[PDB]
Amino acid sequence: EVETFAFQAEIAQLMSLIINTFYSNKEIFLRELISNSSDALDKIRYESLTDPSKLDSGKELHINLIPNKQDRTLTIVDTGIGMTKADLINNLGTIAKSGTKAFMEALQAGADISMIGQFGVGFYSAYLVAEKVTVITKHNDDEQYAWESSAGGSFTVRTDTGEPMGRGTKVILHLKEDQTEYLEERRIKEIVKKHSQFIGYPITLFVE
Ligand SMILES: COc1ccc(-c2c(-c3cc(C(C)C)c(O)cc3O)n[nH]c2NC(C)=O)cc1
Numbered sequence: 001e002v003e004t005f006a007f008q009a010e011i012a013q014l015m016s017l018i019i020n021t022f023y024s025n026k027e028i029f030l031r032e033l034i035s036n037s038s039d040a041l042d043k044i045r046y047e048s049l050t051d052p053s054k055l056d057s058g059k060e061l062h063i064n065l066i067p068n069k070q071d072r073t074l075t076i077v078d079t080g081i082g083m084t085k086a087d088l089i090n091n092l093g094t095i096a097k098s099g100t101k102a103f104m105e106a107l108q109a110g111a112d113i114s115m116i117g118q119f120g121v122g123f124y125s126a127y128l129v130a131e132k133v134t135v136i137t138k139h140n141d142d143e144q145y146a147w148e149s150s151a152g153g154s155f156t157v158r159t160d161t162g163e164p165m166g167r168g169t170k171v172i173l174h175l176k177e178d179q180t181e182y183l184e185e186r187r188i189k190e191i192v193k194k195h196s197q198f199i200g201y202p203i204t205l206f207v208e
Contacts, residue, residue, distance in 0.1 A: 002158045007149075011091060011124075014100045015151045018127045021113065026179070028114045029129050030188070031195035032122030033076045033171055037063045038199050040080025040169060047081065057140055057167035063199070065192070066206045067183040072175050074182050078201075079168040082139035088147045088157060092135060095120045123171075127151060129182055132174040138165045 007015070041061045048054045058079050066075040087093045099120035106115065116122050126133045131150060138144040144164060149155035173182075181187050188205055196203065 002156050004154055004156050005089060006154055008091075008097055010097050010100045012151075012153045014096070014103070014121060014124055015127055017104075018113070018124055019151060023113045023128070025112075025114055026128040027182075027191050028116075028195065029125040029173075030076075030182070030191050032117050032125045034063060034192070034196045034199060034203065035117060036123055037076060037078035037080055037169065038201060040078055040082070041201050043081040044079075044167070054140055057138075061201050063201050063203045064206060065188060065203065067185070067188065067208060069180075069183050069208060072177075072180065072183070074173045074175060074188075076171045076173075077165075077168065078170075079166070082142075082167050082169055083137045083145075084139045084142040085145050085157065086142075087139075088135065088137060088145055092123055092147065094123060096124075126171065126173055129175055129179040130173040131176050134170075134172040134174070136160050136162060136165065136170040136172070138167050138169075140167060 041063070044054065045061060061079055064075075064077040066077065067073075068075070083093050091097070103111075103116060103119035103121060106119065107113075113125070113128075116125050133149060135147040136144065137147070144160040146158050146160040146162070147155060175182060185205065185207060192203055192205070
């Protein structure tokens with residue numbers, strides 16, 4: 001059972017801009033994804049302060065970066081709050097329509113693509129480096145779902161058939177052929193140190 005949805009026109013336009021604009025500083029995608037993971041981790045941490053049972057689906061709050069050269073994928077896993085199916089469909093928990101309008105106006109007022117996170121839509125920067133993105137998520141109040149898109153105006157949602165995640169979100173970046181530097185350990189370490197050095201959860205870079 002796979003459900004196919006059209007992106008709202010504004011989101012499709014954001015994705016097209018990201019895909020088509022000449023912009024060399026692509027490495028910021030990682031900071032954006034890691035920031036989203038941190039925000040999700042903050043949410044479960046806060047909820048757990050008053051209801052510890054919310055951690056029954058996993059006590060550890062962390063971020064894992066998993067390169068796979070054989071599959072040409074970089075995977076960002078977190079044990080944050082997760083998203084419901086409804087939130088996945090509704091632009092992955094983001095205020096994407098309003099954020100996109102603001103980002104577009106800013107780009108006219110001198111901003112650059114690296115500022116995308118100021119507009120709540122940093123997730124879509126994944127398309128700087130990925131031909132396809134799969135987001136697998138589990139929230140305590142819902143089942144495990146997989147969202148996926150190769151852009152082109154549509155996305156799919158299905159009940160996930162992979163390994164259970166307990167709680168959290170996994171973003172799988174199916175990298176463009178010319179973007180394989182983002183699978184290299186030294187490159188990933190450099191980017192995390194540059195842009196994500198103060199994130200308040202352990203970031204573990206897996207090796208191959
Ligand atoms: C800035 O907008 C958002 C929107 C939603 C989340 C979010 C994620 C989550 C979302 C993404 C993207 C696919 C959007 C990701 O890369 C990693 C994540 O852990 N899980 N749970 C939540 N929910 C709350 C309340 O954070 C984070 C930031």
